[PDB]
Amino acid sequence: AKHHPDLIFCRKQAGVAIGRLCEKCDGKCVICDSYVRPCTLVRICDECNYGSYQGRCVICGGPGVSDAYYCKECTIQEKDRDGCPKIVNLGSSKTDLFYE
Amino acid sequence: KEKPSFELSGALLEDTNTFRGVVIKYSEPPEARIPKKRWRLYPFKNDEVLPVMYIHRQSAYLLGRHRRIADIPIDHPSCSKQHAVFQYRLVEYTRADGTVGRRVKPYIIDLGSGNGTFLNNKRIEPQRYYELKEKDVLKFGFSSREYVLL
Amino acid sequence: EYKKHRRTMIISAETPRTDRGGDSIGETPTPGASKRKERNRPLSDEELDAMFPEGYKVLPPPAGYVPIRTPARKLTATPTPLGGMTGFHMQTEMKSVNDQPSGNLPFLKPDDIQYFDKLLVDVDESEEQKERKIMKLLLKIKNGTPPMRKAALRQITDKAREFGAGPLFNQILPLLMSPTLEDQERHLLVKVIDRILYKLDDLVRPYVHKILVVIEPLLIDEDYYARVEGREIISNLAKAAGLATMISTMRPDIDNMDEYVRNTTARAFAVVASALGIPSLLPFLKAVCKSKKSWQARHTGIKIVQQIAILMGCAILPHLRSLVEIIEHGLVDEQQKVRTISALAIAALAEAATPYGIESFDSVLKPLWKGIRQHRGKGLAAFLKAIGYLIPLMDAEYANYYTREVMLILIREFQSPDEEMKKIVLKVVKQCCGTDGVEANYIKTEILPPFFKHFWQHRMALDRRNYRQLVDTTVELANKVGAAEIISRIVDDLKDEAEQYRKMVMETIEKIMGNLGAADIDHKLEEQLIDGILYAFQEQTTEDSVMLNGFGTVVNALGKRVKPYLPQICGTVLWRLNNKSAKVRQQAADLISRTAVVMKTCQEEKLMGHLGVVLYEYLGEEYPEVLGSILGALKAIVNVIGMHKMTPPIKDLLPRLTPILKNRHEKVQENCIDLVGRIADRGAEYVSAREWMRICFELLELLKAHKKAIRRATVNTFGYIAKAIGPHDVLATLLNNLKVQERQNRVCTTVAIAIVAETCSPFTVLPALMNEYRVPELNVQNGVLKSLSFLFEYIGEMGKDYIYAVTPLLEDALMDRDLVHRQTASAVVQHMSLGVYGFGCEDSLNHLLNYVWPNVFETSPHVIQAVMGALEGLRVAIGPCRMLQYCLQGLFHPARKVRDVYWKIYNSIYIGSQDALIAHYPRIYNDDKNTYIRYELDYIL
Amino acid sequence: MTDRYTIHSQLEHLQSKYIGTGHADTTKWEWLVNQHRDSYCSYMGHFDLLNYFAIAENESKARVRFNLMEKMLQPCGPP
Amino acid sequence: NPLTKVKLINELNEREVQLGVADKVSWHSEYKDSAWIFLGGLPYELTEGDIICVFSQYGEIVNINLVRDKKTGKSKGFCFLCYEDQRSTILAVDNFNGIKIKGRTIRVDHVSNYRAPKDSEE
Amino acid sequence: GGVWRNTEDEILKAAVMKYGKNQWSRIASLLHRKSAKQCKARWYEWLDPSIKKTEWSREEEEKLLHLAKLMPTQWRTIAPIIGRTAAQCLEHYEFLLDKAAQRDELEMLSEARARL
Amino acid sequence: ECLEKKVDMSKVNLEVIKPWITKRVTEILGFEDDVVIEFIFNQLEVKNPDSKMMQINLTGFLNGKNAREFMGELWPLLLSAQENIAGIPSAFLEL
Amino acid sequence: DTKLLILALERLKEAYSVKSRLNQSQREELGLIEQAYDNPHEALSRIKRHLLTQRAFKEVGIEFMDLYSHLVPVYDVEPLEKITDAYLDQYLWYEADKRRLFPPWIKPADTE
Amino acid sequence: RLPPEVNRILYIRNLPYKITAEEMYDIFGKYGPIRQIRVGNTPETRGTAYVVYEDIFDAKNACDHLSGFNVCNRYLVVLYYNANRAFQKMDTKKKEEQLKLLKEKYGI
RNA sequence: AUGAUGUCAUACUUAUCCUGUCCCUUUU
């Protein structure tokens, strides 16, 4: 996105697990990364939500509280009918901040 | 078939004093200290003091017939590996003035040799605080020796 | 002491294996000799030439000093016993030395000299020696200022293809191998290894093992982030190199004497198998576990099966059958380890085996159950682990019998001192007794008394894993046998001395009353409850949520059964609300915050008077960490009792809040801004406008916050008060900012311009903004461009009009003064383009697309991705046909650049709306070998 | 049988997985065959377009559908 | 797993020392009223007299008994010894836990259940 | 710190020409990189208009060579006397001149040394 | 090369190919290992194996020059076993 | 070396910061002090390089204080120069007492 | 009673280009018998040397007393030399003959 | 008179981000 250009999404097969968002990343969109116009809910992959991988945020990856949703600008642009956008990789973000 | 004994095992004693390739016996007490008196080992095997070893610079000194345990070998075939151990330690004694204090003096005690030892043509028994001084005619072997130290 | 064998690892196929055979044979020679009878073993001149690097001589001096060195041993005893001493004379008295010789050259630790000595000498400017010499940019990465580390890091990234992997790793692996290595320095060298391994692909093949030897110790580590990094870089290495490279590389470490390398090597195969997939690597494994040489191998390979189970986890599912078919042959093996680790690996499998593939484990069972009878010690517990994870996967009929058999041993084995044991049998009790096909009364009688006897003790709780797992198991037993039982037995322990134990039973009660509900609880036990919870809460050694969330959940679960207990509660709440200054104030405050609703619905109004004015009084507290909790409590009190009923009428409260905003720190800033938000949104009439506009001019600099949520609440509030007043003044006060501060929140003011433009119709506001683009100051020009962007993003449909107004200005902006204009303006075109869709304004969007179109070419990431979003929105709004009519000629153009880009675009147009493209592909004539005319469209009735 | 050609991966990038997107180095015949296959798929998917195509010709709907499915592989001759 | 028990006991003692626990809840209320401590992981060349001499630094042991196995010298590696008071057992579990004695390290913990012949893990 | 870039040096020269010389706090409020003492030291070291930054001759070298032996320390005292007055060009010239030119019984003895 | 003809391991035996593969592995790698025998067992376990994948797996393990000759010797013996109606190579008819 | 540097920096900190006052010069002094207490070997490197190299000095500060009987003027120095000179001073006194160079005549020292 | 990272090899620097191996052997020969010593004869490595002793504790007493020890005008850089790094220039081989010997002579 | 590589400051963007830990390495 915005917060991270080197991050890669999962884009796996869509399952029946509804996605969730963390308390620090509440209200933020997954594709458009906006805060207004939520139109479609976020669905997670089957391998992305299993055991300890269930109930986690898609973007933040932390403890999810509320369910995540997609932006209406991404819904009208057909950017929400793609695969599961689970953040798998984590590069150049929250790595040197742990040392300080 | 069982026979547990709960006695003193050798491994706990060997782990406390562990040498390079053998066990280490004849440990000094806690009252050992570095000597500051004017004393040097003058060895005369053929009335000529070729070598000279400082006894106040080192804390431990082991001489034997083995090259792996000892640091420097010795040319004495009639002496065992553990025959005599001359170590300096400040023991409880009185000076000439009568005041008590710490005096650096050498300790003389037999370590249980197989043939014993002799000093100034006289055998000395262990566990007896003998007045050891400089220029003593000692023997560094179990039976006899052709070399004396001063 | 186990891990420090790392320090003994020297740096780095038939020859490779030939070496291990000789290594083990020398081990048998030496080991044998002692029976026949370390690093100090004497050495040989070839071995001597082996250690030191290139360019040194072993030339001696005279023929009378080497004999001194030989007598030195004998004379180390002899001459130490001889005359010697040193002295000094008083006499009057050149001093050379070297720090790092360079323009700056950030400093060298006294040890690192050994590595970087070559840099110290100043000889310069006369091939490879100059590449090693210039490669000391490493030193700039290791030690120096952060900017030096950044710039150095890039410079070495782009020189990868140049220098090659050989010199780099040759000059790195010693450093990453250094005994004095830091935490940070380690991590940074890991970073450079990654970044260079994103490029080098075929090159690394000789160095792969030479890498892994240092890296595999990262997999076993106390730090977690170190582990995820390690797994990542081994993933990049294995995928980077070839499969056969990895395989053929890593064999000799399987039979290596030390088990350390075997283990970490197993996790290595786990990572590489995640990289290149299970089926590719299967025949290797399946070959390994059947190796007839020695057991250690099979032990390793089985451990590999396990670590694959942990790593891949849920994704094992397809090959589960083949994997089982591999592992099954080790359960019956004569060696023990292989059996143990085997069944353990079955466990890991089944645990990653989500409710399915039961029959794949099928043939495994019948031996296991049999083994359950005859085993003593750890292997037994391991089997219990496996069977434990299995049982949820069986049928409640077969698992009825089998379960009822397991329960016996499960009972008998509670009492073992082994903590591994207790972990296993614990989680077991969870799965076996958390089965729907198990009867309550049987558990109530047989299990619970020994369970609370042996398991609940102060050995457990002090440990971490045992703590958690215990919590879970107890929670589930509550889930079956019911609530009042478990709680009723563990209440008396709330009053126990130690903290951690109290914490444990407290969180247990919390989760229990969370799930089952408080309805089951009787009266007396409820008295013991509330008293227990107060008592435990009155002594807090550390600050933590467990006690608080615990209390809150207990009360909210009890509902209004708690009402008789309030005066005791809140009495404690006020008295504690003094006592501890910095420690407990914040905590009692938060207690109020979470108990608000309960103190409301039961209609105790005196208590709301109390909390209202009492808390009102603490707003002068100088300690921020307290004050924050105070404001939070006020917040929660606002959400229960309404505006006009506030016992501290808002006229009092709000201006008393206003000065606090200088607090800066989020602790007071967070809750404060929040509350100003709640009141500013809800009532908002109680306060006169003058106060409000002052609040504005105070809010303006809150945008320096380092936290995102602060700015969040801030902007939303600013919208609320924008409603309370009306647009023009406040949007002017936003335009007062020239966006000089690029740090903290700047564009945030832009967002305020957006939301303000929403709160009352932007149909009013736009002319002011559009006029304010005139100002010659550039950064605020791009600022108002952003304001348009977010503006259309929030307004959506309503832009069906204002498009025209913004159109010529976008013309001026999109026509480039400087790149940021084109970028931001393009984003505006995007959000406009999504917003207006389908309403028939496309024409002017085409006009703007003209000026958009030249910007297609550039290497700047933000402008190219911006333009991409732009042309995507323009795709959906205009329709593909026009897009494609701009994208045709660029596809086949001779240059590489144009083709790269126009094909990127054409792909973006292609993926979406691929169905609607059909009509618009032009007519393309047919050549000799191929017919390029689609004649179907030319069929005419 | 040394081939020295292992199109496996590099740095988890590119790796085309879709069909009909195309590249910058795409030939004219491959793009024409992909456009013809997309046109055949759009004719087979749309019911009104298939009805308008079968009403003009004297063939039936299922025969024209089988002819369009048979002409998909080699519908214009791979370049 | 074989040597992780002493590490787990040391981690529990470190967590009890760092969590701010008093003397009443310092992992002693669950192993109270019993001076019988469980020792496991000893060397195969250690006798009962040497273990009784090494474990007498914190007080005189009342009843010590080594795990008898392999009819030749009764050697299995485990040992059970009851001290005089519970404070001596607490000091032995707090000081002699995880220490090294003649090569391989041993483990010191409390059982406080009964006297059983086969209760440790080899 | 104190990198003394050229764009900062021009701004410091403009602040010295516009504001004044005996007002160091007024010149430090328009640079955002150095303090007032560092700005005054830069103005007295490199930004001074009377500093002779070039033309090293043999008369000044002979003056500095005939002054470093009379006073070995206190190079700041010989800064304005030699004429350089930069307090660092004198030490650099001394280092260049040192590197380029490098490339009772006792009395009884001497008494008999003349009598023999 | 010789790895372009399609073959099938279901029409050929497996016990007669173990000694020739063991001799080829002892000639190539010098000694006898357990990873190469397991790789040869996994390469013939499928009913329709891949000659190019087996050649890549042999070039990754061995040097490549001897691995190409080993693949060319294993493809011809498998072809002679699959072409025969019995399902055995030419080295099994004599002994 | 390091033991002497810690002692001298402790004295310099205890004097220059006591309680809740500042400047901007004193702020840079406290900051360099904290950086020295964070990366001590680098600071010892800095001090050694300065003491062997830089034979110059920056402009020191002075304004007298008035114990109104006899005024006794008190001089102030620039920060990093003060730190380096302070480690030099504690070094000089350490080697002086180890050498017993100043006699027992000049008796102002560590009896009381 | 020793840190593990120290090894029998010591990297020694701040050496003159004229320095003699006589002074080398003499000085360093205090602590124990020399396994051997190398000296850089190459343009970059001139001024550096590596010392190797029959025992580690030798080297420990060495770096103890020889820390910042003086020669000519110089204070030598005395560090414990690292391991691994650049090794594989040589190989693992020639184990077969010696192992065959110990398998022959003692017969074990 | 553009453009080229190059050591070196300076602004700008990413609504970039400040409580992250071993709740999993337990390898002889």
Q: Which residues of C772-798 are buried (b: 16+ CB within 10 A; e: fewer)?
A: bbeeeeeebbbbbbbbbbbbbbbbbeb
Contact with chain D for residue C277, Cβ under 8 A: no
Instruction: Compute the distance between CA of residue B85 and CA of residue B117 in angstroms, rounded to an integer.
Output: 11
Residues forming beta bridges with residue I70, ordered by sequence position: I75
**Strand J contact at CB of residue C819, distance < 7 A:** no
| DSSP category for residue A57 | B
- Give the residues across from B107 on adjacent strands: B87
Q: Is residue A71 a known part of a binding site?
A: yes
Structure tokens at D4: 């020295």
CB-based contacts of D3: which residues, under 8 Å, 6+ apart?
G52, G55, G56
Q: How many residues does chain F have?
A: 116
Q: What is the residue extent of each domain of chain A?
A: 8-88
Residue C767 contacts A, CB cutoff 8 Å: no
Q: In whole angstroms, how far apart are CA C218 and each of B21, C108, C211, C247?
A: 37, 26, 12, 20
Cβ pair E37, E108 in contact under 8 A: yes
How far does Cα I50 stand from its chain's mean position? 5
Chain E partners within 8 Å of C542 (Cβ)? 19-20
Nucleotide J28, nearest residue via CA and C1': C259
- The C-alpha atoms of residue C574 and residue C615 are separated, in whole angstroms, by 10
Report the C-alpha gap between F64 and F78 in whole angstroms: 8
Beta-carbon contacts of residue C2 (< 8 Å; ≥ 6 apart): C260
- C-beta atoms of C930 and D45 within 8 A: no
Q: Decide if F88 and H56 are in contact by the 8 Å CB cutoff.
A: yes
CB H42 within 8 Å of CB C107 = yes
Our count of domains for chain E comes to 1
Q: Does residue C343 contact residue C332 with C-beta atoms inside 8 Å? A: no
> What is the domain class of I3-82 according to CATH?
alpha beta
Q: Quick check: F76 contacting H, CB < 8 Å?
A: yes
CB contacts under 8 A, H 44-103 vs F, are: 55-59, 78
Cross-strand pairs, E105: E100
Query: CA-CA-CA-CA torsion for B123, B129, B134, B138, nearest 10 degrees?
Result: 20
Could you tell me which residues are beta bridge partners of residue E38?
E80, E109
Whether E113 sits with its Cβ under 7 A from any strand J atom: the answer reads no
Q: Could you tell me the resolution of this structure in angstroms?
A: 8.0
Candidate from H41, H49, H52 with C-beta closest to C110 = H41
Please answer whether residues I37 and C59 qualify as being in contact, where contact means their C-beta atoms are separated by less than 8 angstroms: no
Cβ-based neighbour number of residue C591 at 10 Å: 24
Q: Residue I39's beta-bridge partner residues?
A: I49
Q: Are C298 and C288 in contact (CB under 8 A)?
A: yes
CB pairs under 8 A between C and H: 8
- At residue D62, φ and ψ (nearest 5 deg) are -70, -35
Partner C, chain D 40-69, Cβ-Cβ below 8 Å: 40, 42-43, 45, 53, 55-57, 68
Return the structure tokens found at F3: 């990198």
Q: Which helix (H) or strand (E) holds I11?
A: strand I9-13
* Chains H and E, touching by 3 or more CB pairs within 8 angstroms: no
Residue with nearest Cα to nucleotide J23 C1': C465
**Can you tell me the distance from the alpha carbon of C198 to that of C156, in angstroms, rounded to the nearest whole number?**
13
Using alpha carbons only, what angle is made at residue E63 by residues E60 and E68, rounded to the nearest 5 degrees?
A: 130
Q: Are E106 and E42 in contact (CB under 8 A)?
A: yes
**DSSP secondary structure code for residue I44 in this structure:** T
- Residue C18: CB atoms within 10 A of its CB come to 18
Half-sphere exposure of C429 (CA within 13 A, CB side): 32
Residues 6+ apart with CB under 8 A from G2: D1, G71, G72, G75, G76
HEC sequence for C831-885: HHHHHCCCCCCHHHHHHHHHHHHHHHCCCCHHHHHHHHHHHHHHHHHHCHHHHHH
- Helix ranges (DSSP H) in C375-498: 378-390, 398-412, 419-433, 440-446, 448-450, 465-481, 483-490
Task: Annotate D46-58 with DSSP letters as a single string.
Answer: -HHHHHHHHHHSS
Alpha helices in C559-688 (DSSP H): 566-576, 585-601, 605-618, 624-638, 650-657, 666-681
Largest distance between two CA atoms of chain F: 80
Protein-to-nucleotide distance from the CA of C132 to the C1' of J2, whole angstroms: 38
> Quick check: A24 CB within 7 A of strand J?
yes
A29 labelled binding-site residue = yes
Residue F92: CB partners within 8 Å, gap ≥ 6?
A: none
> Where in the sequence is the domain holding C375, given as residue range(s)?
104-922
- Taking Cα atoms as reference points, which of A75, C615, C283 lies closest to residue G43? C283
Q: Is E12 on the interface with C (CB under 8 A)?
A: yes
As given in the structure block, the two tokens for residue C614 are 């009492």
**H-run or E-run covering A20:** strand A20-22
SS3 label, residue A56:
strand
- Report how far residue C207's alpha carbon sits from residue C205's, in angstroms, rounded to the nearest whole number: 6
Domain G1-94 falls under CATH 3.40.50.1580: no
H/E stretch holding H95 = helix H79-99
| Cross-chain CB nearest to C939 (options D28, D39, D56) | D56
Q: Which residue matches tokens 């939301």?
A: C755
Task: State the Cα–Cα distance between residues E112 and C521, nearest whole angstrom.
Answer: 34
Please state, in angstroms and rounded to a whole number, the distance separating the CA atoms of residues C584 and C548.
12
Number of structural domains (chain C) is: 1
On whether the CB atoms of residues C589 and C632 are closer than 8 A, the answer is yes
**Alpha carbons C522 and C515: distance in angstroms, whole number:** 17
Partner-chain contact C793 A34, CB within 8 Å: yes
How many alpha carbons fall within 13 Å on the CB side of residue C188? 23
Best CA proximity match to B84, nearest among B53, B45, B123: B123
| Structural domain harbouring E6 | 2-122
Decide if G35 and C17 are in contact by the 8 Å CB cutoff. no
Residue A3 carries which DSSP code? Answer: S
Of C451, C338, C432, the residue nearest C393 (C-alpha) = C432
Asked whether residue C4 is assigned to any structural domain, the reply reads no
**DSSP state at residue H58:** P
Any idea of the CA torsion for C586, C589, C590, C594, to the nearest 10 degrees? 180
- Kind and range of the H or E run holding C193: helix C184-197
Domain ranges for chain D, please list them: 15-79
Question: Is the Cβ pair G38, C248 closer than 8 Å?
Answer: no
Q: Where are the alpha helices (DSSP H) in C726-777?
A: 727-735, 747-759, 762-772
Q: Do you know the residue count of chain G?
A: 95
Burial class (CB in 10 A: 0-12, 13-18, 19+), C306: buried
CB contact under 8 A, D1 and G52: yes
Let me know: does C910 contact D21? Beta carbons within 8 Å. Answer: yes
Q: Is A39 annotated as a binding residue?
A: no
Helix (H, G, I), strand (E, B) or coil at C753: helix
DSSP H helices, I14-55, are 21-28
Burial of C452 (C-beta count, 10 Å sphere; 0-12/13-18/19+): middle
User: Which nucleotides along chain J are within 7 A of a protein C-beta?
Assistant: 8-28
Eight-state DSSP code of residue C511: H
Angle of the C184-197 helix axis to the C165-176 helix axis, nearest 10: 160
Enumerate the domain spans of chain I: 3-82
User: What is the per-residue DSSP string for E6-71?
Assistant: HHHHHHHHHHHHHTT--TTSSS-SSS-S--EEEEE---TT--HHHHHHHTTTTS--SEEEE---ST
Please provide the DSSP assignment of chain F as one string. Answer: -----HHHHHHHHHHHHHT-SS-HHHHHTTTSSS-HHHHHHHHHHTS-TT---S---HHHHHHHHTTTTT-SS-TTTTHHHHT--SSSHHHHHHHHHHHHTT--HHHHHHHHHHH-
Distance of CA H109 to the CA centre of its chain: 19
Query: What is the largest distance, in Å, between two alpha-carbon atoms of chain A?
Result: 42
The 3 state secondary structure assigned to chain B is CCCCCCCCCHHHHHHHCECCCCECCCCCCCCECCCCCCCCECEECCCCCCCCECCCCCCCCCCCCCCCCCCCCCCCCCCCCCCCCCEEEEEEEECCCCCEEEEEEEECCCCCCCCCCCCCCCCCCCCCCCCCCCCCCCCCCCCCCCCEEC
DSSP secondary structure string for all residues of chain G: -GGGS---GGGS-SSSSHHHHHHHHHHHSSS--SHHHHHHHHHTTSSS--HHHHHHHHHHHS-SHHHHHHHHHHHHHHHHHHHSSS---THHHH-
* Residue-level length of chain I: 108
Q: Are the beta carbons of C58 and C48 closer than 8 angstroms?
A: yes
* Closest by Cα among C503, C501, C518 to C556: C518
CB pairs under 8 A between B and C: 43
CA dihedral E77, E80, E83, E86 (to 10 degrees): 110
With beta carbons less than 8 A apart as the criterion, state whether C359 and C324 touch: no
C-alpha distance across the termini of chain B, in Å = 57
Say if the Cβ atoms of C418 and E29 lie within 8 Å. Answer: no
Interface list for B 124-143 with E (CB within 8 A): none
Q: Does C75 touch chain B (CB under 8 A)?
A: yes
Q: What is the CATH number of the domain that holds E74?
A: 3.30.70.330
Domain coordinates in residue numbering, chain G = 1-94
d(CA C201, CA D12): 12
Spatial neighbors of C27 by CB under 8 A, at least 6 apart, are: C257
- List chain B residues with CB under 8 Å of C73: 71-72
- Hey, is the C-beta of B100 within 8 angstroms of any chain E C-beta? no
Q: In this structure, are strands H75-76 and I49-53 parallel, antiparallel, or unpaired? A: unpaired
d(CA C278, CA C264): 19
